[PDB]
Amino acid sequence: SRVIVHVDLDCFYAQVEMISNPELKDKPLGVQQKYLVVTCNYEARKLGVKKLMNVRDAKEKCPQLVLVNGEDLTRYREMSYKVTELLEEFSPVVERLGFDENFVDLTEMVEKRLQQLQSDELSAVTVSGHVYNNQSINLLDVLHIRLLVGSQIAAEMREAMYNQLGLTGCAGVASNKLLAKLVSGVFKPNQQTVLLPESCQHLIHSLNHIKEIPGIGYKTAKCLEALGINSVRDLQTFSPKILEKELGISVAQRIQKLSFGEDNSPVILSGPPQSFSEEDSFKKCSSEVEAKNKIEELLASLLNRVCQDGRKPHTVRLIIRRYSSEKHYGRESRQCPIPSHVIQKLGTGNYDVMTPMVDILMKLFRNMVNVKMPFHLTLLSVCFCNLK
DNA sequence: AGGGCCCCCCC
DNA sequence: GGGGGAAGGACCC
Ligand SMILES: Cc1cn([C@H]2C[C@H](O)[C@@H](COP(=O)(O)OP(=O)(O)OP(=O)(O)O)O2)c(=O)[nH]c1=O
Ligand SMILES: [Mg+2]
């Protein structure tokens, strides 16, 4: 039995912007990214704003919406890693998911605490925060005790995140990642919830569509629907065999175990970043077939700010999509090597890599289905994977 | 909007 | 029978 905690920060970007300009922590705030309010503080989430596009929307219903541009991600990424590192201090095995979510495997830490505790104060163990579904605690239930201890470590992490970094967020404590992630969102404004085993089904059936289950995105959702599957119970009771003969024995078994709140996936130690991507606009809304720029911009600070961590990349990749349907149907990249020696220097002559990156990108692009809708249709994305 | 595991060669 | 490198998927924050 594992004790996993899922940490999810409150409207992350807004938080990082509010901490920068205090005169914002009192009025409806939204962070804008090319006519798309990616997020906003709760002091505006009540005003109908739901991370929706159209900058004008909230604007009207909030003159002093004071929107801030969040295109440059530097500040967010830095705070993101400070959160992960603080968490890593509590326990080494920490997995990142986006810039503001972290899973932490607390199993060993919980045990170390229990063993350290007396055979009398064990009945004094209490919970920190909410108990999902207001379920009654049984102090003689070893799993209840361990999960309550987990709730205590979660409260400590949130407290330390606030005292040391000035950030608030929610936490969810459960026996696996799926359940921890689902329960962390029960009481969302800066609070935490722990899930005792007997309430697992209640939590899973509280969802209104199999697509709300972590591990089932836009794709599988559609495939399950066309198969007569919309509710969680529909998946739990669907014939395994047929499911297996539709998504494979791999996906079928996994997808179906999730419907029961079963997930054995391990919390992965993310450690340092395995790549340094950095997309750009003027190609999703309107572009001029730029090039010398789609290489100096995309790869701007992406260079002078890669020596900080002191690590060398060995591969470049350009991702490209197109004007499609359904949802965001558009995945078409292009990767290549990155010569060492002079290219991967360590002195002043770093500009020399500018040109080389040009020709490659400007070759892997002209080979991007240049015949049917490959131009001007939302794209632009470069990567720096493979580092050692 | 910005960021981050899973066919072909040539041996 | 056996590796390494591309180009793209696929899935998520
Ligand atoms: C999902 C998603 C998140 N993000 C960014 C915005 C968020 O600040 C950050 C974290 O993802 P989220 O957690 O889903 O966004 P949030 O923290 O603002 O919302 P909540 O308080 O309800 O948990 O990453 C994107 O840029 N694009 C996306 O498609
Ligand atoms: Mg969040």
Side-chain angles (χ1 to χ4, degrees):
Chain A
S1 60
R2 292 182 292 150
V3 172
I4 307 302
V5 64
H6 179 247
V7 181
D8 194 334
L9 303 194
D10 309 318
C11 52
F12 192 52
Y13 291 1
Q15 265 204 85
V16 179
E17 292 307 334
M18 294 190 291
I19 288 175
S20 285
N21 190 181
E23 65 177 54
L24 295 179
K25 67 181 300 180
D26 297 297
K27 53 187 173 183
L29 169 60
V31 177
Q32 174 179 160
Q33 282 184 168
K34 298 283 159 46
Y35 290 61
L36 197 172
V37 183
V38 281
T39 196
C40 59
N41 60 18
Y42 287 81
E43 193 55 59
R45 189 156 303 188
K46 76 154 193 171
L47 300 178
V49 190
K50 299 198 64 177
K51 309 175 181 176
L52 49 76
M53 67 177 273
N54 194 298
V55 179
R56 187 61 60 180
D57 289 358
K59 268 294 183 180
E60 304 300 1
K61 59 183 61 58
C62 180
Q64 185 183 58
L65 182 66
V66 186
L67 290 173
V68 179
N69 189 81
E71 279 158 39
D72 179 356
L73 304 187
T74 295
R75 297 181 173 180
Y76 305 143
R77 184 178 293 124
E78 305 184 318
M79 190 63 42
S80 172
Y81 277 99
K82 290 189 181 176
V83 174
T84 301
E85 288 180 44
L86 172 166
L87 290 179
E88 286 173 291
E89 199 177 309
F90 279 81
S91 203
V93 193
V94 181
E95 193 190 317
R96 294 166 49 83
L97 190 53
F99 281 13
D100 79 352
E101 283 183 55
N102 288 276
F103 288 90
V104 191
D105 189 314
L106 303 174
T107 316
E108 300 203 8
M109 191 180 160
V110 166
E111 276 302 302
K112 170 183 170 298
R113 289 197 177 193
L114 284 184
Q115 290 181 53
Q116 185 64 296
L117 180 58
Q118 267 60 299
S119 184
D120 47 61
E121 296 300 58
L122 183 67
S123 63
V125 173
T126 60
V127 65
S128 180
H130 304 271
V131 171
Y132 180 77
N133 193 44
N134 195 66
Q135 175 174 177
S136 301
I137 302 171
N138 192 324
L139 298 164
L140 302 186
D141 191 313
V142 298
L143 298 170
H144 277 32
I145 294 297
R146 291 163 67 269
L147 291 166
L148 296 195
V149 166
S151 71
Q152 286 169 37
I153 296 171
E156 287 170 16
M157 302 169 139
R158 297 177 56 235
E159 174 80 2
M161 281 189 286
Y162 180 68
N163 291 326
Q164 298 186 30
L165 305 177
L167 297 164
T168 62
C170 302
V173 175
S175 70
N176 63 45
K177 295 208 289 168
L178 164 67
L179 300 176
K181 180 169 175 62
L182 284 175
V183 83
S184 74
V186 176
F187 296 88
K188 293 193 75 298
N190 181 30
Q191 303 163 61
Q192 67 184 64
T193 309
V194 57
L195 177 75
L196 300 185
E198 299 82 12
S199 290
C200 175
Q201 290 319 106
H202 188 285
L203 215 216
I204 208 66
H205 288 304
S206 62
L207 304 177
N208 287 303
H209 198 296
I210 57 182
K211 60 179 181 181
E212 299 180 357
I213 295 175
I216 297 176
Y218 203 75
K219 180 281 181 64
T220 297
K222 300 300 179 179
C223 176
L224 293 168
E225 300 182 7
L227 182 52
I229 302 179
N230 292 86
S231 80
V232 169
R233 194 176 304 287
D234 279 349
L235 216 185
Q236 289 186 175
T237 66
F238 191 76
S239 69
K241 326 77 184 63
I242 298 180
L243 196 68
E244 193 175 309
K245 294 184 175 184
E246 295 289 344
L247 297 175
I249 188 177
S250 172
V251 175
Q253 295 185 297
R254 182 173 63 82
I255 242 65
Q256 195 161 69
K257 277 189 67 61
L258 291 173
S259 74
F260 292 83
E262 274 150 37
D263 168 19
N264 297 296
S265 67
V267 169
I268 309 285
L269 190 157
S270 292
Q274 291 178 54
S275 61
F276 299 66
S277 178
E278 187 162 303
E279 308 182 55
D280 194 302
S281 58
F282 55 60
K283 204 170 183 183
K284 305 173 186 177
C285 296
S286 57
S287 63
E288 302 71 60
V289 191
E290 302 173 60
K292 61 188 65 178
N293 307 297
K294 299 179 182 176
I295 307 172
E296 295 179 300
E297 301 187 65
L298 285 168
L299 314 174
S301 57
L302 176 58
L303 306 176
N304 294 300
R305 306 302 161 62
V306 65
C307 299
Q308 305 186 301
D309 59 302
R311 299 168 64 215
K312 57 179 182 180
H314 295 292
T315 299
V316 296
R317 176 180 163 184
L318 178 71
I319 312 172
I320 297 297
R321 42 283 188 181
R322 288 165 49 182
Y323 187 118
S324 61
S325 57
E326 190 61 63
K327 186 56 183 178
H328 291 300
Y329 268 5
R331 310 292 182 182
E332 289 179 295
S333 304
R334 273 275 154 65
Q335 58 191 64
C336 285
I338 305 177
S340 59
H341 48 298
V342 296
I343 300 74
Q344 293 184 55
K345 64 295 154 300
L346 191 63
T348 305
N350 302 56
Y351 190 60
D352 71 295
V353 69
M354 196 68 80
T355 304
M357 297 296 100
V358 184
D359 47 295
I360 39 178
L361 279 56
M362 303 298 91
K363 192 289 284 59
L364 294 178
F365 188 110
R366 290 194 174 186
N367 186 60
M368 196 70 85
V369 67
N370 185 301
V371 60
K372 302 298 179 181
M373 299 179 88
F375 240 65
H376 292 57
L377 291 180
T378 300
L379 55 172
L380 197 61
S381 175
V382 179
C383 174
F384 262 15
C385 188
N386 295 299
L387 299 77
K388 292 164 291 185

